[PDB]
PDB file of all heavy atoms in Angstrom:
ATOM      1  N   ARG A  23     103.109  94.355  94.060  1.00  0.00           N
ATOM      2  CA  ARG A  23     101.746  94.609  94.518  1.00  0.00           C
ATOM      3  C   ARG A  23     101.430  93.824  95.790  1.00  0.00           C
ATOM      4  O   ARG A  23     100.884  94.372  96.761  1.00  0.00           O
ATOM      5  CB  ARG A  23     100.784  94.240  93.394  1.00  0.00           C
ATOM      6  CG  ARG A  23      99.386  94.757  93.512  1.00  0.00           C
ATOM      7  CD  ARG A  23      98.722  94.636  92.156  1.00  0.00           C
ATOM      8  NE  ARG A  23      97.270  94.695  92.226  1.00  0.00           N
ATOM      9  CZ  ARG A  23      96.564  95.810  92.126  1.00  0.00           C
ATOM     10  NH1 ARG A  23      97.148  96.983  91.967  1.00  0.00           N
ATOM     11  NH2 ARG A  23      95.239  95.742  92.183  1.00  0.00           N
ATOM     12  N   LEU A  24     101.793  92.536  95.807  1.00  0.00           N
ATOM     13  CA  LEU A  24     101.573  91.704  96.985  1.00  0.00           C
ATOM     14  C   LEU A  24     102.382  92.197  98.178  1.00  0.00           C
ATOM     15  O   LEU A  24     101.905  92.156  99.317  1.00  0.00           O
ATOM     16  CB  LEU A  24     101.924  90.250  96.678  1.00  0.00           C
ATOM     17  CG  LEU A  24     100.950  89.460  95.812  1.00  0.00           C
ATOM     18  CD1 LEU A  24     101.588  88.172  95.335  1.00  0.00           C
ATOM     19  CD2 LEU A  24      99.669  89.173  96.568  1.00  0.00           C
ATOM     20  N   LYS A  25     103.613  92.652  97.936  1.00  0.00           N
ATOM     21  CA  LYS A  25     104.443  93.155  99.028  1.00  0.00           C
ATOM     22  C   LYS A  25     103.880  94.444  99.616  1.00  0.00           C
ATOM     23  O   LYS A  25     103.917  94.635 100.835  1.00  0.00           O
ATOM     24  CB  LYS A  25     105.879  93.357  98.554  1.00  0.00           C
ATOM     25  CG  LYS A  25     106.627  92.054  98.351  1.00  0.00           C
ATOM     26  CD  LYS A  25     108.067  92.283  97.953  1.00  0.00           C
ATOM     27  CE  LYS A  25     108.822  90.970  97.894  1.00  0.00           C
ATOM     28  NZ  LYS A  25     110.251  91.160  97.535  1.00  0.00           N
ATOM     29  N   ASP A  26     103.343  95.331  98.771  1.00  0.00           N
ATOM     30  CA  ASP A  26     102.703  96.542  99.285  1.00  0.00           C
ATOM     31  C   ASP A  26     101.461  96.213 100.105  1.00  0.00           C
ATOM     32  O   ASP A  26     101.230  96.819 101.164  1.00  0.00           O
ATOM     33  CB  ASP A  26     102.344  97.486  98.140  1.00  0.00           C
ATOM     34  CG  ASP A  26     103.542  97.871  97.303  1.00  0.00           C
ATOM     35  OD1 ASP A  26     104.684  97.665  97.763  1.00  0.00           O
ATOM     36  OD2 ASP A  26     103.342  98.377  96.180  1.00  0.00           O
ATOM     37  N   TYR A  27     100.661  95.250  99.644  1.00  0.00           N
ATOM     38  CA  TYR A  27      99.500  94.821 100.419  1.00  0.00           C
ATOM     39  C   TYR A  27      99.913  94.234 101.764  1.00  0.00           C
ATOM     40  O   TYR A  27      99.310  94.539 102.800  1.00  0.00           O
ATOM     41  CB  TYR A  27      98.693  93.805  99.620  1.00  0.00           C
ATOM     42  CG  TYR A  27      97.468  93.283 100.327  1.00  0.00           C
ATOM     43  CD1 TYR A  27      96.292  94.012 100.345  1.00  0.00           C
ATOM     44  CD2 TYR A  27      97.484  92.052 100.965  1.00  0.00           C
ATOM     45  CE1 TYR A  27      95.171  93.536 100.984  1.00  0.00           C
ATOM     46  CE2 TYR A  27      96.370  91.569 101.605  1.00  0.00           C
ATOM     47  CZ  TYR A  27      95.215  92.314 101.614  1.00  0.00           C
ATOM     48  OH  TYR A  27      94.098  91.833 102.249  1.00  0.00           O
ATOM     49  N   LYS A  28     100.942  93.383 101.765  1.00  0.00           N
ATOM     50  CA  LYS A  28     101.412  92.770 103.002  1.00  0.00           C
ATOM     51  C   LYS A  28     102.002  93.803 103.953  1.00  0.00           C
ATOM     52  O   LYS A  28     101.880  93.664 105.173  1.00  0.00           O
ATOM     53  CB  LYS A  28     102.442  91.686 102.683  1.00  0.00           C
ATOM     54  CG  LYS A  28     102.776  90.775 103.842  1.00  0.00           C
ATOM     55  CD  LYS A  28     101.605  89.890 104.222  1.00  0.00           C
ATOM     56  CE  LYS A  28     101.979  88.959 105.363  1.00  0.00           C
ATOM     57  NZ  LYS A  28     100.879  88.026 105.718  1.00  0.00           N
ATOM     58  N   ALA A  29     102.633  94.847 103.416  1.00  0.00           N
ATOM     59  CA  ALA A  29     103.125  95.928 104.257  1.00  0.00           C
ATOM     60  C   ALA A  29     101.996  96.764 104.841  1.00  0.00           C
ATOM     61  O   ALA A  29     102.147  97.298 105.942  1.00  0.00           O
ATOM     62  CB  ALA A  29     104.079  96.818 103.464  1.00  0.00           C
ATOM     63  N   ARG A  30     100.874  96.892 104.136  1.00  0.00           N
ATOM     64  CA  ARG A  30      99.742  97.651 104.653  1.00  0.00           C
ATOM     65  C   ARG A  30      98.726  96.791 105.401  1.00  0.00           C
ATOM     66  O   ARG A  30      97.701  97.314 105.844  1.00  0.00           O
ATOM     67  CB  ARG A  30      99.058  98.411 103.519  1.00  0.00           C
ATOM     68  CG  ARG A  30      99.923  99.508 102.934  1.00  0.00           C
ATOM     69  CD  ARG A  30      99.380 100.030 101.626  1.00  0.00           C
ATOM     70  NE  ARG A  30      97.985 100.431 101.714  1.00  0.00           N
ATOM     71  CZ  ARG A  30      97.324 101.034 100.737  1.00  0.00           C
ATOM     72  NH1 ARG A  30      97.908 101.320  99.585  1.00  0.00           N
ATOM     73  NH2 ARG A  30      96.050 101.362 100.919  1.00  0.00           N
ATOM     74  N   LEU A  31      98.981  95.495 105.555  1.00  0.00           N
ATOM     75  CA  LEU A  31      98.035  94.590 106.199  1.00  0.00           C
ATOM     76  C   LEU A  31      98.151  94.645 107.720  1.00  0.00           C
ATOM     77  O   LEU A  31      99.256  94.635 108.268  1.00  0.00           O
ATOM     78  CB  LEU A  31      98.260  93.158 105.717  1.00  0.00           C
ATOM     79  CG  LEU A  31      97.331  92.077 106.273  1.00  0.00           C
ATOM     80  CD1 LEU A  31      95.924  92.248 105.735  1.00  0.00           C
ATOM     81  CD2 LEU A  31      97.866  90.694 105.954  1.00  0.00           C
ATOM     82  N   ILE A  32      97.004  94.690 108.393  1.00  0.00           N
ATOM     83  CA  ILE A  32      96.906  94.602 109.846  1.00  0.00           C
ATOM     84  C   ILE A  32      96.233  93.277 110.171  1.00  0.00           C
ATOM     85  O   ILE A  32      95.059  93.084 109.849  1.00  0.00           O
ATOM     86  CB  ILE A  32      96.104  95.772 110.431  1.00  0.00           C
ATOM     87  CG1 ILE A  32      96.789  97.102 110.134  1.00  0.00           C
ATOM     88  CG2 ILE A  32      95.883  95.587 111.921  1.00  0.00           C
ATOM     89  CD1 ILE A  32      95.978  98.288 110.577  1.00  0.00           C
ATOM     90  N   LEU A  33      96.950  92.369 110.826  1.00  0.00           N
ATOM     91  CA  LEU A  33      96.444  91.026 111.091  1.00  0.00           C
ATOM     92  C   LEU A  33      96.122  90.884 112.575  1.00  0.00           C
ATOM     93  O   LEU A  33      97.028  90.847 113.413  1.00  0.00           O
ATOM     94  CB  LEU A  33      97.457  89.974 110.644  1.00  0.00           C
ATOM     95  CG  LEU A  33      97.024  88.515 110.759  1.00  0.00           C
ATOM     96  CD1 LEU A  33      95.764  88.275 109.956  1.00  0.00           C
ATOM     97  CD2 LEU A  33      98.132  87.597 110.290  1.00  0.00           C
ATOM     98  N   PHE A  34      94.838  90.794 112.896  1.00  0.00           N
ATOM     99  CA  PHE A  34      94.395  90.610 114.272  1.00  0.00           C
ATOM    100  C   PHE A  34      94.631  89.169 114.718  1.00  0.00           C
ATOM    101  O   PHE A  34      94.489  88.242 113.918  1.00  0.00           O
ATOM    102  CB  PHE A  34      92.916  90.955 114.414  1.00  0.00           C
ATOM    103  CG  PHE A  34      92.593  92.389 114.115  1.00  0.00           C
ATOM    104  CD1 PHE A  34      92.320  92.798 112.821  1.00  0.00           C
ATOM    105  CD2 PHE A  34      92.547  93.325 115.132  1.00  0.00           C
ATOM    106  CE1 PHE A  34      92.021  94.113 112.547  1.00  0.00           C
ATOM    107  CE2 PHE A  34      92.246  94.643 114.862  1.00  0.00           C
ATOM    108  CZ  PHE A  34      91.982  95.037 113.570  1.00  0.00           C
ATOM    109  N   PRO A  35      94.992  88.955 115.983  1.00  0.00           N
ATOM    110  CA  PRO A  35      95.188  87.586 116.472  1.00  0.00           C
ATOM    111  C   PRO A  35      93.886  86.807 116.557  1.00  0.00           C
ATOM    112  O   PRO A  35      92.802  87.376 116.701  1.00  0.00           O
ATOM    113  CB  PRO A  35      95.811  87.791 117.858  1.00  0.00           C
ATOM    114  CG  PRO A  35      95.449  89.169 118.241  1.00  0.00           C
ATOM    115  CD  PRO A  35      95.404  89.956 116.978  1.00  0.00           C
ATOM    116  N   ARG A  36      94.007  85.482 116.446  1.00  0.00           N
ATOM    117  CA  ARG A  36      92.843  84.611 116.565  1.00  0.00           C
ATOM    118  C   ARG A  36      92.284  84.628 117.982  1.00  0.00           C
ATOM    119  O   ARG A  36      91.063  84.644 118.174  1.00  0.00           O
ATOM    120  CB  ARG A  36      93.207  83.190 116.141  1.00  0.00           C
ATOM    121  CG  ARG A  36      93.536  83.063 114.667  1.00  0.00           C
ATOM    122  CD  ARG A  36      94.125  81.710 114.330  1.00  0.00           C
ATOM    123  NE  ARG A  36      93.193  80.623 114.597  1.00  0.00           N
ATOM    124  CZ  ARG A  36      93.371  79.373 114.198  1.00  0.00           C
ATOM    125  NH1 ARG A  36      94.441  79.011 113.512  1.00  0.00           N
ATOM    126  NH2 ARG A  36      92.448  78.461 114.489  1.00  0.00           N
ATOM    127  N   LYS A  37      93.157  84.615 118.982  1.00  0.00           N
ATOM    128  CA  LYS A  37      92.774  84.816 120.372  1.00  0.00           C
ATOM    129  C   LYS A  37      93.404  86.118 120.836  1.00  0.00           C
ATOM    130  O   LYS A  37      94.610  86.319 120.668  1.00  0.00           O
ATOM    131  CB  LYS A  37      93.224  83.646 121.248  1.00  0.00           C
ATOM    132  CG  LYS A  37      92.370  82.406 121.089  1.00  0.00           C
ATOM    133  CD  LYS A  37      92.756  81.323 122.079  1.00  0.00           C
ATOM    134  CE  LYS A  37      91.849  80.113 121.938  1.00  0.00           C
ATOM    135  NZ  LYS A  37      92.264  78.994 122.819  1.00  0.00           N
ATOM    136  N   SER A  38      92.583  87.003 121.404  1.00  0.00           N
ATOM    137  CA  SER A  38      93.069  88.325 121.788  1.00  0.00           C
ATOM    138  C   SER A  38      94.079  88.240 122.924  1.00  0.00           C
ATOM    139  O   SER A  38      95.052  89.001 122.957  1.00  0.00           O
ATOM    140  CB  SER A  38      91.893  89.219 122.174  1.00  0.00           C
ATOM    141  OG  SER A  38      91.523  89.019 123.524  1.00  0.00           O
ATOM    142  N   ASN A  39      93.875  87.310 123.859  1.00  0.00           N
ATOM    143  CA  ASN A  39      94.761  87.208 125.011  1.00  0.00           C
ATOM    144  C   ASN A  39      96.075  86.511 124.687  1.00  0.00           C
ATOM    145  O   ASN A  39      97.009  86.582 125.493  1.00  0.00           O
ATOM    146  CB  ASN A  39      94.059  86.475 126.152  1.00  0.00           C
ATOM    147  CG  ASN A  39      93.595  85.092 125.756  1.00  0.00           C
ATOM    148  OD1 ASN A  39      92.743  84.936 124.885  1.00  0.00           O
ATOM    149  ND2 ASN A  39      94.155  84.078 126.396  1.00  0.00           N
ATOM    150  N   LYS A  40      96.175  85.832 123.542  1.00  0.00           N
ATOM    151  CA  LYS A  40      97.391  85.129 123.135  1.00  0.00           C
ATOM    152  C   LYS A  40      97.772  85.540 121.717  1.00  0.00           C
ATOM    153  O   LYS A  40      97.509  84.801 120.757  1.00  0.00           O
ATOM    154  CB  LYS A  40      97.213  83.616 123.230  1.00  0.00           C
ATOM    155  CG  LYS A  40      97.192  83.081 124.647  1.00  0.00           C
ATOM    156  CD  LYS A  40      97.167  81.565 124.665  1.00  0.00           C
ATOM    157  CE  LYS A  40      97.367  81.030 126.074  1.00  0.00           C
ATOM    158  NZ  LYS A  40      97.316  79.545 126.124  1.00  0.00           N
ATOM    159  N   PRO A  41      98.393  86.706 121.542  1.00  0.00           N
ATOM    160  CA  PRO A  41      98.864  87.085 120.207  1.00  0.00           C
ATOM    161  C   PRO A  41     100.105  86.298 119.816  1.00  0.00           C
ATOM    162  O   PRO A  41     100.894  85.883 120.667  1.00  0.00           O
ATOM    163  CB  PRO A  41      99.171  88.578 120.353  1.00  0.00           C
ATOM    164  CG  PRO A  41      99.530  88.730 121.782  1.00  0.00           C
ATOM    165  CD  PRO A  41      98.681  87.749 122.542  1.00  0.00           C
ATOM    166  N   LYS A  42     100.274  86.100 118.514  1.00  0.00           N
ATOM    167  CA  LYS A  42     101.414  85.382 117.967  1.00  0.00           C
ATOM    168  C   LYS A  42     102.370  86.359 117.297  1.00  0.00           C
ATOM    169  O   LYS A  42     102.073  87.542 117.126  1.00  0.00           O
ATOM    170  CB  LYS A  42     100.956  84.306 116.976  1.00  0.00           C
ATOM    171  CG  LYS A  42      99.955  83.323 117.547  1.00  0.00           C
ATOM    172  CD  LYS A  42     100.506  82.609 118.767  1.00  0.00           C
ATOM    173  CE  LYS A  42      99.455  81.720 119.395  1.00  0.00           C
ATOM    174  NZ  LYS A  42      99.964  81.009 120.594  1.00  0.00           N
ATOM    175  N   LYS A  43     103.543  85.843 116.921  1.00  0.00           N
ATOM    176  CA  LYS A  43     104.584  86.704 116.370  1.00  0.00           C
ATOM    177  C   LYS A  43     104.282  87.130 114.939  1.00  0.00           C
ATOM    178  O   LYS A  43     104.834  88.127 114.462  1.00  0.00           O
ATOM    179  CB  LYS A  43     105.941  86.006 116.454  1.00  0.00           C
ATOM    180  CG  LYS A  43     106.115  84.840 115.494  1.00  0.00           C
ATOM    181  CD  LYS A  43     107.262  83.932 115.923  1.00  0.00           C
ATOM    182  CE  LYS A  43     107.009  83.247 117.267  1.00  0.00           C
ATOM    183  NZ  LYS A  43     105.579  82.922 117.536  1.00  0.00           N
ATOM    184  N   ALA A  44     103.416  86.402 114.239  1.00  0.00           N
ATOM    185  CA  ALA A  44     102.994  86.809 112.906  1.00  0.00           C
ATOM    186  C   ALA A  44     101.826  87.783 112.936  1.00  0.00           C
ATOM    187  O   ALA A  44     101.369  88.213 111.874  1.00  0.00           O
ATOM    188  CB  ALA A  44     102.618  85.584 112.074  1.00  0.00           C
ATOM    189  N   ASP A  45     101.348  88.139 114.120  1.00  0.00           N
ATOM    190  CA  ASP A  45     100.155  88.946 114.281  1.00  0.00           C
ATOM    191  C   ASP A  45     100.532  90.403 114.538  1.00  0.00           C
ATOM    192  O   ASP A  45     101.607  90.712 115.055  1.00  0.00           O
ATOM    193  CB  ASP A  45      99.326  88.392 115.434  1.00  0.00           C
ATOM    194  CG  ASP A  45      98.626  87.102 115.068  1.00  0.00           C
ATOM    195  OD1 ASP A  45      98.567  86.775 113.866  1.00  0.00           O
ATOM    196  OD2 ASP A  45      98.129  86.416 115.979  1.00  0.00           O
ATOM    197  N   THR A  46      99.634  91.300 114.165  1.00  0.00           N
ATOM    198  CA  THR A  46      99.888  92.725 114.347  1.00  0.00           C
ATOM    199  C   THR A  46      99.705  93.103 115.813  1.00  0.00           C
ATOM    200  O   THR A  46      98.679  92.761 116.408  1.00  0.00           O
ATOM    201  CB  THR A  46      98.960  93.558 113.468  1.00  0.00           C
ATOM    202  OG1 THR A  46      99.227  93.274 112.090  1.00  0.00           O
ATOM    203  CG2 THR A  46      99.163  95.042 113.717  1.00  0.00           C
ATOM    204  N   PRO A  47     100.677  93.775 116.428  1.00  0.00           N
ATOM    205  CA  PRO A  47     100.523  94.185 117.829  1.00  0.00           C
ATOM    206  C   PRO A  47      99.426  95.227 118.008  1.00  0.00           C
ATOM    207  O   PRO A  47      99.112  96.000 117.095  1.00  0.00           O
ATOM    208  CB  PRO A  47     101.901  94.751 118.187  1.00  0.00           C
ATOM    209  CG  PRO A  47     102.826  94.182 117.175  1.00  0.00           C
ATOM    210  CD  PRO A  47     102.031  94.045 115.922  1.00  0.00           C
ATOM    211  N   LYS A  48      98.853  95.233 119.215  1.00  0.00           N
ATOM    212  CA  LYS A  48      97.680  96.049 119.515  1.00  0.00           C
ATOM    213  C   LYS A  48      97.966  97.538 119.369  1.00  0.00           C
ATOM    214  O   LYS A  48      97.092  98.309 118.956  1.00  0.00           O
ATOM    215  CB  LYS A  48      97.183  95.728 120.927  1.00  0.00           C
ATOM    216  CG  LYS A  48      95.920  96.461 121.329  1.00  0.00           C
ATOM    217  CD  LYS A  48      94.785  95.502 121.621  1.00  0.00           C
ATOM    218  CE  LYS A  48      93.444  96.155 121.337  1.00  0.00           C
ATOM    219  NZ  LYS A  48      92.377  95.703 122.268  1.00  0.00           N
TER     220      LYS A  48
END
C-alpha cells in the first residue's frame, strides 16, 4: 500500500528555482 502511494505521489520542490533529486520534475 505504501509503495503504491509512493509511486503515485507527486512531490513539489521546496524552492521552485532549485529542484532536488528527490523531487518530482516539472
Side-chain angles (χ1 to χ4, degrees):
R23 196 164 161 91
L24 286 167
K25 287 183 174 181
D26 303 344
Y27 180 81
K28 193 68 178 183
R30 293 167 53 173
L31 181 69
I32 298 175
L33 185 58
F34 297 87
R36 293 170 63 169
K37 284 186 178 176
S38 84
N39 58 296
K40 287 186 171 179
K42 305 302 175 180
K43 71 198 64 33
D45 286 346
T46 297
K48 183 118 208 214

